[PDB]
Amino acid sequence: SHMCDAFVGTWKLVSSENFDDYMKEVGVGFATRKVAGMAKPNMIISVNGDVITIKSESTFKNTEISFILGQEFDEVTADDRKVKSTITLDGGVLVHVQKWDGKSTTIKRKREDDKLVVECVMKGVTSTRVYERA
Ligand SMILES: CCc1c(-c2cccc(OC)c2)[nH]c(=S)n(C)c1=O
Numbered sequence: 816s817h818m819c820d821a822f823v824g825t826w827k828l829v830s831s832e833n834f835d836d837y838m839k840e841v842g843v844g845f846a847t848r849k850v851a852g853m854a855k856p857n858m859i860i861s862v863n864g865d866v867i868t869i870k871s872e873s874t875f876k877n878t879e880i881s882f883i884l885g886q887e888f889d890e891v892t893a894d895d896r897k898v899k900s901t902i903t904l905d906g907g908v909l910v911h912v913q914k915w916d917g918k919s920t921t922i923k924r925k926r927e928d929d930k931l932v933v934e935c936v937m938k939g940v941t942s943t944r945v946y947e948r949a
Pocket residue numbers: 851852854855856871872873875876877878892893894922933935944
């Protein structure tokens with residue numbers, strides 16, 4: 816076993832707060848905000864050795880990232896940014912930093928009771944997205 820074990824599984828979005836405002840701060844345009852904001856993604860998290868995979872599947876887009884903690888990678892986001900990402904584990908929280916165009920956003924994923932809570936921060940704007948087991 817590894818501590819990342821508690822993230823593994825299939826998760827479904829059950830609530831979202833302030834996500835439109837977060838998307839605006841990121842620079843997402845109107846039509847993508849509207850359609851992306853409707854989506855109810857599932858997130859599939861798995862681990863094989865040192866490699867963590869996070870798949871997100873929705874009616875809007877499907878995405879997949881695979882990575883090693885602390886090792887930067889290329890990511891194309893659901894809203895089509897080409898970003899450089901680094902994901903670390905800080906005190907049991909997965910911390911995902913995306914950098915593009917001189918900008919940065921941080922996505923934190925944590926287990927809280929039976930939920931997986933996702934906090935997305937762009938400058939002063941935070942969105943909270945709650946997932947439960949599928
Ligand atoms: C903008 C991408 C994004 C989504 C998301 C939103 C809509 C559809 C979708 O399809 C896979 C994914 N969800 C969360 S929780 N975070 C942290 C994101 O960065």
